[PDB]
Amino acid sequence: SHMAVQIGFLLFPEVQQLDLTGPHDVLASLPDVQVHLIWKEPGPVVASSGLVLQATTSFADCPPLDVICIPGGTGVGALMEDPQALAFIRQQAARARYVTSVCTGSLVLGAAGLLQGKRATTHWAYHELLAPLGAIPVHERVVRDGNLLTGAGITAGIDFALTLAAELFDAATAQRVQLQLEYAPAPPFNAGSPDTAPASVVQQARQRAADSLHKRREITLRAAARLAA
């Protein structure tokens, strides 16, 4: 309808698609929501896995949003230094009811200056990069600070989206969607946190992510310097 809640996700090359698609299917289950996938121009955008998604609107044509949500992925490093994307995020966050992200999408909110003095979370492996962007780093799944909601790594998007659903509507509506999605998780292993995974597994992961972390630390401090100027 013309009175729909307007929810927008940034869709960028090398996005981690589950950061977007998990929340999308949760929030699209709510009454009279319109969901936008936003990029520089409408058309195909390839996620890090090779899954092809389709941007529905340009930055220029996007209506004022009630909710803006930034997903994460390999592609966030480019976004943290993309003045056109950062200007769009700041413009929308001026009037949004909720300013949100999942996983390393909070590093993009950070680069836009929107985490200064705010409680935030991100993916466990990149959590150290929050403080240089002015955030108060919080080790929880879903972190609220006023109208800022951030989710932790990838699958946290589902917990984030149900939290946001209860804020947009009410607990009863969020619980109905939880039941429709049969979201009573029973993971076959207990390796979803660095605190509970086998130490051999946590060490293999930190080994893998090391080169990405050092690269993103330099991008993070260049982004922080621009906020300081």
3-class SS at 9? Answer: strand
| 163 touching a copy of itself, by CB under 8 A | yes
| 124 touching a copy of itself, by CB under 8 A | yes
**Distance (Å, whole) CA 172 – CA 115:** 30
Applying CB under 8 A, among 60, 184, 199, 228 the residue interacting with a copy of itself is: 184
**Distance (Å, whole) CA 133 – CA 114:** 9
Applying CB under 8 A, among 7, 148, 156, 168 the residue interacting with a copy of itself is: 156
Applying CB under 8 A, among 31, 41, 54, 63 the residue interacting with a copy of itself is: 54
Q: Is the distance from CB of 177 to CB of 24 less than 8 angstroms?
A: no
**Distance (Å, whole) CA 35 – CA 83:** 24
Applying CB under 8 A, among 7, 35, 93, 129 the residue interacting with a copy of itself is: 35
The b-or-e profile of 151-179 (16+ CB within 10 A means b, else e) is bbbbbbbbbbbbbbbeebbeeeebeebbe
Taking the complex as a whole, the smallest distance from the CB of residue 79 to a copy of itself amounts, in Å, to 19
- Given the rule CB under 8 A, which of 74-82, 84-92, 93-101, 195-203 is the region that contacts a copy of itself? 195-203
Applying CB under 8 A, among 132, 134, 137, 194 the residue interacting with a copy of itself is: 194
Q: Is the distance from CB of 57 to CB of 38 less than 8 angstroms?
A: yes
Name the one residue in this structure whose structure tokens are 């529905």: 56
Q: Which of 103, 120, 133, 148 is catalytic?
A: 103
Name the percent of the chain in helix, strand, coil, to the closest 5. Answer: 40, 20, 40
Q: Which is nearer to a copy of itself, 6 or 86 (CB)?
A: 6
Q: Which is nearer to a copy of itself, 24 or 118 (CB)?
A: 24
Q: Which is nearer to a copy of itself, 30 or 93 (CB)?
A: 30
- Closest CA relative to residue 131, chosen from 115, 145, 108, 152: 115
- By CB under 8 A, name the binding residues for a copy of itself: 16-18, 21-22, 24-25, 28-29, 35, 37, 44, 49-54, 103, 123-124, 141-142, 152-156, 158-159, 162-163, 166, 171-172, 174-176, 178-189, 191-194, 196-198, 200-202, 204-205, 208
